[PDB]
Design a protein around this ligand. Structure first.
Ligand SMILES: N#Cc1c(Oc2ccc(F)c(NC(=O)Cc3cccc(C(F)(F)F)c3)c2)ccc2nc(NC(=O)C3CC3)sc12
Ligand SMILES: Cc1cc2nc3c(=O)[nH]c(=O)nc-3n(C[C@H](O)[C@H](O)[C@H](O)COP(=O)(O)O)c2cc1C
Ligand SMILES: O=C(O)c1cc(=O)[nH]c(=O)[nH]1
Length: 363
């Protein structure tokens, strides 16, 4: 907590204090690619290991899509101590994304509103960049560090499906799992791909392009869903997942809600709210979706995580894996070691074989 406290109290406040929220994120990425980051002196205890989507996850804590959108800072993230990395979302053709401002700090509610709108260097590039490190990722994967690739759609793309397929084509080989981003609040009518008829059509075309690749190339296909769903929405996504045999789910993306009693002086700003106020929704949606999948669909639980307890709660409500992002903004890179550390604790304390032995215990 010594190094953790110092980042939380000083190094980060003075940074996020110094720069606008975006420039801060841009620097964090670049510093991570350059390797200007501290060495996490935490060897993962055999406990935290998890197997799912047919892979070995040394630890269940991973980075969420949106930090390394273009896949520049892959190694840095692993050294940070993440058990698995998820880059993206990536778009077929490269695009500016919405204009700045587009990242806002809510210091007071330990949260963040973002409306990036899928800024991406495009598949054509990110390919070259993953192809370049093709071989080290291989070793990293079979050593227990898998790489996920989050797929998106261009602003002015009429059929998202043709967009994604093109994603599964280009980056599916170099991926150990693909996320179908269907949950971004910051792109035109994207959330309408969570609809039964439009979701089934989408994932059928994605899997058609997927099940059209060399077996060794074949990545796990997952779907990222928003925390803001009707009682109906959830059920239909559950159905269409199982119905199609989708390898797993991510739960959740950012919320367009603004939970009553946000102190953030920027809470009115348009976009997806990450961090603390999302924690509850995310877990309630990870739970509800487990019951609906009958626990038979691997859920990666993301949203609000910044502690060992935070993570556990997701794991216990169906989370086969966990992810965090917004935390970093406030806790710095040391938050990764911190969650893992405080997890081992609240596992042993409640008497659990490892992590697998707590996956959906709340059920
Ligand atoms: N993680 C993180 C993170 C962050 O910290 C980083 C990130 C990568 C690094 F490599 C280091 N390295 C060091 O600290 C070590 C060091 C090296 C050289 C000099 C010094 C010193 F200056 F101390 F001398 C110290 C620190 C900073 C801003 C930031 N913004 C975020 N997200 C958002 O803004 C919103 C989008 C959500 S995450 C984030
Ligand atoms: C600035 C920012 C950019 C993001 N970009 C993406 C993205 O491109 N694709 C995606 O699937 N999720 C994106 N997310 C959502 C995160 O991956 C995650 O689902 C969400 O932030 C909740 O996790 P957290 O509260 O631990 O950050 C982004 C979040 C933030 C704050
Ligand atoms: O690109 C964005 O703005 C974005 C994408 C996504 O999936 N989630 C999010 O919160 N923002």
């Amino acid at each position: 907590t010594g190094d953790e406290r110092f980042y939380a109290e000083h190094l980060m406040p003075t940074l996020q204090g110094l720069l606008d929220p975006e420039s801060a994120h841009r620097l964090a990425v670049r510093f991570t690619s350059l390797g200007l980051l501290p060495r996490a002196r935490f060897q993962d205890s055999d406990m935290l290991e998890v197997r799912v989507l047919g892979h070995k996850f040394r630890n269940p804590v991973g980075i969420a899509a949106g930090f390394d959108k273009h896949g520049e800072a892959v190694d840095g993230l692993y050294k940070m101590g993440f058990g698995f990395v998820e880059i993206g979302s990536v778009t077929p053709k490269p695009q500016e994304g919405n204009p700045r401002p587009r990242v806002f700090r809510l210091p007071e509610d330990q949260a963040v509103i973002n409306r990036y709108g899928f800024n991406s260097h495009g598949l054509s590039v990110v390919e070259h960049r993953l192809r370049a490190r093709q071989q080290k990722q291989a070793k990293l994967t079979e050593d227990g560090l898998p790489l996920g690739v989050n797929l998106g759609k261009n602003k002015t793309s009429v059929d998202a499906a043709e967009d994604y397929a093109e994603g599964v084509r280009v980056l599916g080989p170099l991926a150990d799992y693909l996320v179908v981003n269907v949950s971004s609040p910051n792109t035109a009518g994207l959330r309408s791909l969570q609809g039964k008829a439009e979701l089934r059509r989408l994932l059928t075309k994605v899997l058609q392009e997927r099940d059209g690749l060399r077996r060794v190339h074949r990545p796990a296909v997952l779907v990222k869903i928003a925390p803001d769903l009707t009682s109906q929405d959830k059920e239909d996504i559950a159905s269409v997942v199982k119905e199609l045999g989708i390898d797993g789910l991510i739960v959740t993306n950012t919320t367009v809600s603004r939970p009553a009693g946000l102190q953030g002086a920027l809470r009115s700003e348009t976009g997806g709210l990450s961090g603390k106020p999302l924690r509850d929704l995310s877990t309630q949606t990870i739970r509800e979706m487990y019951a609906l999948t009958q626990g038979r669909v691997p859920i990666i639980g993301v949203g609000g995580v910044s502690s060992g307890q935070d993570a556990l709660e997701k794991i216990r409500a169906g989370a086969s894996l966990v992810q965090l992002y917004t935390a970093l903004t406030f806790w710095g890179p040391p938050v990764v070691g911190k969650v893992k550390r405080e997890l081992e604790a609240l596992l042993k304390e409640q008497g659990f074989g490892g992590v697998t032995d707590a996956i959906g215990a709340d059920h």
